[PDB]
Design a protein that fits this description.
Blueprint lengths: L8 H8 L9 H11 L12 H6 L5 H18 L6 H4 L1 H22 L4 H5 L6 E5 L7 E4 L8 E5 L7 E7 L4 E4 L1 H4 L5 E3 L17 E2 L4 E4 L1 E8 L5 H11 L6 H26 L15 H18 L4 H17 L3 E3 L4 H6 L3 E5 L10 E12 L2 E9 L10 E3 L2 E2 L6 H12 L4 E4 L6 E4 L2 H13 L11 H4 L2 H7 L2 E10 L4 E8 L10 E6 L1 H6 L1 E6 L2 E4 L2 H16 L5 E8 L16 H4 L3 E10 L6 H10 L3 E6 L3 H11 L12 E3 H6 L2 H10 L2 E3 L5 H10 L5 E5 L5 H6 L2 E5 L4 H5 L3 E3 L5 H40 L8 H11 L1 H7 L23 H24 L39 H20 L17 H19 L2 H5 L9 H9 L1 H15 L4
Parallel strand pairs: 11-25, 11-28, 21-24, 25-27, 26-27, 28-29, 29-30
Antiparallel strand pairs: 1-2, 1-3, 3-9, 4-7, 4-9, 5-6, 5-8, 10-30, 12-13, 12-24, 13-14, 14-15, 16-17, 18-19, 19-20, 20-23, 21-22, 23-24
Helix pairs in contact: 4-6, 4-11, 10-11, 11-28, 12-28, 12-30, 14-15, 28-30, 28-31, 28-32, 29-32, 30-33, 31-32, 31-36, 32-33, 32-35
The structure holds ligand TG1, phosphomethylphosphonic acid adenylate ester, magnesium ion (2 copies) and sodium ion (NA).
The site of phosphomethylphosphonic acid adenylate ester has 15 residues, from helix 15, strand 19, strand 20 and strand 23.
GO molecular function: ATP binding; ATP hydrolysis activity; calcium ion binding; P-type calcium transporter activity
Membrane topology: Multi-pass membrane protein
Organism: Oryctolagus cuniculus
Amino acid sequence: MEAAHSKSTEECLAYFGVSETTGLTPDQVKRHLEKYGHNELPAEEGKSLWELVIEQFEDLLVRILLLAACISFVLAWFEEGEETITAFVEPFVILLILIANAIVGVWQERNAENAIEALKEYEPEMGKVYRADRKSVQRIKARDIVPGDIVEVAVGDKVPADIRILSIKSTTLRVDQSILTGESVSVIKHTEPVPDPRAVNQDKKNMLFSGTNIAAGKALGIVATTGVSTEIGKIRDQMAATEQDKTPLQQKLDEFGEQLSKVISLICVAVWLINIGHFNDPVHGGSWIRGAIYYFKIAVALAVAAIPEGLPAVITTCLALGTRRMAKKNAIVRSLPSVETLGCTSVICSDKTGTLTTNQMSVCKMFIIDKVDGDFCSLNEFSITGSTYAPEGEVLKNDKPIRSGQFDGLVELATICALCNDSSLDFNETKGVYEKVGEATETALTTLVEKMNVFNTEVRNLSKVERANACNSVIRQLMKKEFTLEFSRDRKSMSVYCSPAKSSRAAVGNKMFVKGAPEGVIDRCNYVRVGTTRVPMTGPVKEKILSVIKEWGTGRDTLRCLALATRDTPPKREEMVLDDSSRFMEYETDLTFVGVVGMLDPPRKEVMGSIQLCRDAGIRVIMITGDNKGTAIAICRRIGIFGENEEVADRAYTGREFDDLPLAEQREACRRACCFARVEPSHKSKIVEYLQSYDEITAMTGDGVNDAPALKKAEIGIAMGSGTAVAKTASEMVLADDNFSTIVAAVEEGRAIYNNMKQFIRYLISSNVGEVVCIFLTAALGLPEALIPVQLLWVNLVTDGLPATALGFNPPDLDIMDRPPRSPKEPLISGWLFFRYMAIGGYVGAATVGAAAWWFMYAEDGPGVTYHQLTHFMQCTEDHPHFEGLDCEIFEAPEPMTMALSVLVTIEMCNALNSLSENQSLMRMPPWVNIWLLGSICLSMSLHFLILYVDPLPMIFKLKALDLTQWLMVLKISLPVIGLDEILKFIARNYLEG
Ligand SMILES: C/C=C(/C)C(=O)O[C@H]1C(C)=C2[C@H]([C@@H]1OC(=O)CCCCCCC)[C@@](C)(OC(C)=O)C[C@H](OC(=O)CCC)[C@@]1(O)[C@H]2OC(=O)[C@@]1(C)O
Ligand SMILES: Nc1ncnc2c1ncn2[C@@H]1O[C@H](COP(=O)(O)OP(=O)(O)CP(=O)(O)O)[C@@H](O)[C@H]1O
Ligand SMILES: [Mg+2]
Ligand SMILES: [Mg+2]
Ligand code: NA
């Protein structure tokens, strides 16, 4: 029964055919259980370790790699010779990476919470109901409760389902609904029907929401909905339907996969089309089998050189490091892939209270009526000092300190602030600061009465824990608070019924002290107070009060204004029903206006600046606030969102105004608006949706489960540190300090991290290109394999891994925040850069093949057989080309390979330097610009020698030490790469910029 809040109490019982006294009969329970199912959200989809491991092999690249582990395996088997010490190494190395890859992948899934599963923290195990099969109450499992049965909840209980309250047994019922309505103050529940069938949860004052807590009292009610039909259930379904896309990088990396896999196959075909010359050879002769192994062998190499095996780990390493660095700035990122997307932030939708502002309320102006005499009218405007909650400050008129007591209006003004309040101050012996007890708004009032001290009550003698609520006490001792009519959004005011203290059996003197939003309260005033006297509210004077209020709330003061008033002749105690909030407004009629107080919720001292960085970064900032439209714009102009005098007609909307617009015009509004006030539950989510239709990477804030859907949907959901765990688990980032500026700071870090990743990413893929040139060259030509798998793998995981990781620390640019947000569709490599890496690759393809073929031609220590046509044969099934001399295994000489491997390695340490900057020569930006790079290149070489002299290794890698002569040829072929890049960089600077 979704609409239970709008139905009468008798209507719900009638609807479910149940009696309040007996409860449901076992037949009903059974029948209802089958119609509505159990009261619980569906279980998470169980993903098994097996399935969690099989997924690790879904990526195109880890599949190609696996395939190569097979070909390599098979070959390692059906191979000639007897060296099994290095034979099965190639396949086992590949497999190990595929294993560590799985282990890591699976490891992440074990420890990784999900928002949906976090909601279940709010469903209790048990609940208490009354069923026709037993007189007494019986506590059962929440899972077994059903729509229709009578339930009982008491203070401490966690509501097991969405319940329509039938009767409140205690005196009053208070509920902690924080997780659902964001209301941190417990709210009072009634049993009268709430008329609007379309009322939002906050106004359903006759409902208990599953997952909430009974703050105080005891009540009986009928279950309206259960499971996924509850408020928290509907939130669970919205989240499950929300699908977060893959980050721009992940997508680029995915497209790279398909293509790399598509190129690897075309290079194979090619190597085949270049060896078609074998179809013109006699069937007899030639060791075919020793030719098939050659193709496959290079195929494996083809793949191993094409796949940047170490990239994923570098990215991760760099991301962990940035993350730890962002934490230092209070920005807690939960998803490493989010650091990127965060830098792309196009829009930032932020809540005002506690994020843009401090939520440290302080009254700083107040006014009463000075006198009324016909058309003439004068008010008494005042000012207060002290922005804290501490009773340290003072009232001043025309800037001159006065004593409140000398004015009567202020005595009463102060009475109202003290009595019509549920808040109090408390001095922390520890922090030595006065804390607030209750709503920030009411505490500001409490703080005000202490400063005013209408009765001059000497308090300087009193301690600090006493100074706290001194003047208040004085006022409480004067009037007796008989009861209070809670605040409610419909009437936007609250009041307390009071009777004098020192008074015997009397039927006169009772008063009501009303406080609330000015327009509503002032409208219910038929009288204005002047000191101690009273006269009829006149059109004019009502304008005077209203204009000042408009000035304080709409003007630069951006003050939250409150009208204070009294009902001199309130109704008789017995003539009031303190059960139907709906009658509270009438009770607060025929009032007497006493004055206004305007408090300030100050903007964080860093937001103005952060708002400016956003404008500089081309990032739009949208404010979402509970304030009315006028004050919301005023605050927006104040913190810089809007210009002091710019037109914002169609750039700020209220929830109501927004709903009235047709879908088409709502979408349009969302591209222009920077201010949303009085926004509905479904709005944050709709705004995100509209923003995404314009392809903007959105950042949205929130803290309760009710914000969870929106947070999940926004590219970057931002949760408050002080918010719920659900909001946190549903978000990409958590603000440890709740501060808006912490967001902007995180965005810049996000831009700097990616610029670096772009460098080490292009660096790594750049080599993989060269490696694949060498393999294709050393094949289409038919030369001895220049480089082999086990070697390449070391270069891509260790040799090139270090420089890459160091690259992640390149200093960031200065105008990092003077540039607009990066387009997600922006490729990492294209245009001239593509050509640059095209050439560089062709170069590394030669520099390797050459240094290998060099040692087989013009090299001393090696077959100085120049032009000996290594091409001619690798069969030696003839030995004819070489008359005298029995030796055909020097083709496998490890000396040349070392030349290729040292060339690669050397060039990559060089290319790592060509990476410090995309287009700046090493002239303007020297290698020492990143000391971590240098130190990293020093470590990569010390590791190169490590595998050259430490016996166990040189064999495994098929390597041998080099001559100081040869090492020079390595340099004479590597070091030039830098000049090559410099020419290319140069060409891009002064011949393609503009
Ligand atoms: C990794 C190694 C190699 C050799 C590879 O196949 O890279 C290609 C490839 C798949 C792309 C290319 C390589 O393309 C070529 O070399 C063109 C064909 C001629 C090959 C002849 C070989 C003898 C990248 C690497 O290189 C250069 C130097 O042009 C740049 C870029 O890559 C990126 O932007 C990186 C994405 C994370 C991609 O065009 C990319 O495809 C895409 O979808 C992109 C957008 O991704
Ligand atoms: N305890 C209280 N007593 C009387 N009036 C109050 C009040 N708290 C707020 N008001 C008045 O009611 C109007 C606001 O309604 P509400 O209190 O729900 O909004 P808000 O400004 O507190 C944001 P949120 O609803 O998100 O907490 C305020 O602008 C103020 O004038
Ligand atoms: Mg409020
Ligand atoms: Mg919230
Ligand atoms: Na999200």
